[model samples]
Target: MQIPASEQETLVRPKPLLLKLLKSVGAQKDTYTMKEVLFYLGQYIMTKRLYDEKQQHIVYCSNDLLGDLFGVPSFSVKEHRKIYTMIYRNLVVV
Candidate 1:
């Protein structure tokens, strides 16, 4: 009962701002599935140690690119889950 990858998801192009953000974090693909974007984002966060120590669920926006995308000093894990929807504005879904 497994679904094929191609049928399950489509690739999306990032708008300029999002592309910049992704490139800053080393995700250089011209197009990506949302999952790929989230995976790279999680990798960047972990690599940068952006999680607040006192509050494990809180993620800090320690860089200008991340700050521009998330538009906050920090965000909760709950909000991170919804980032896909928020980042849609920065994606070209063609």
Candidate 2:
């Protein structure tokens, strides 16, 4: 044989988006309710390392602000991507 294929481990496991979100939070995304929002928002504090004692203050403010950002907003993945882009723009973050 001129060539051989080596066995390699898969880098990415497949799962549905809302399932991942549910793993983060509540039952379903069919409604995508405020409950879901509240649950996942706290994840930023842990995942982004924003939860020191001093930094804890920012969490309340940012959580409310981010809740406002998503209020009656899009429920689809594509729109959420654009929504984040708009969030960065509206926040004037370059």
Candidate 3:
């Protein structure tokens, strides 16, 4: 039998801590693409209106999940890549 490469893509499983955070947003899944995770997280941020008033790029932490994950009260959206890097620490490649 032959397998297809097109069906294969990078997938990651959230660690316990990350899972706890993601679950709050109703993202109950075993694995997810990086984009999917970010999309859900972004939605959560928007739903909670966590953006700073003076700077839209700055997002303020409003819960323990974000507080623990970010280790800071606020962060710039421009650092999204860096944020993903930090998120990677709590993900396992599948």
| Best-matching candidate per lDDT | 3
Global lDDT of each candidate: 0.70, 0.36, 0.74
Residue by residue across 1-94, what tens digits does model 3's lDDT show? 2324432356889888778878888659989877676777787787788876578678888464676776777888778566767777888888
Error of 2 at 26 (Å): 8.5
Q: Give a tens-digit lDDT track for model 2, residues 5-88.
A: 221111222124323534544444333333333345456435654344464233332443333443532233234454444333
| Model 1 stretches with alpha carbons more than 4 Å out | 1-8, 25-27
TM-score of structure candidate 3: 0.77
lDDT score at residue 7, model 1, on the 0-100 scale = 30
- The order of the candidates by lDDT, greatest first, is 3, 1, 2
Looking at model 3, report the run of 10 residues with the lowest lDDT sum: 1-10
Model 2 steric clash total: 0
lDDT of 3 at 49: 83
Top candidate (TM-score):
3
Query: What is the alpha-carbon lDDT for the whole of candidate 2?
Result: 0.36
What TM-score, over all chains together, does every model reach? 0.72, 0.28, 0.77
The reply for model 2, stretches above 4 Å from the true place, is 1-30, 60-94
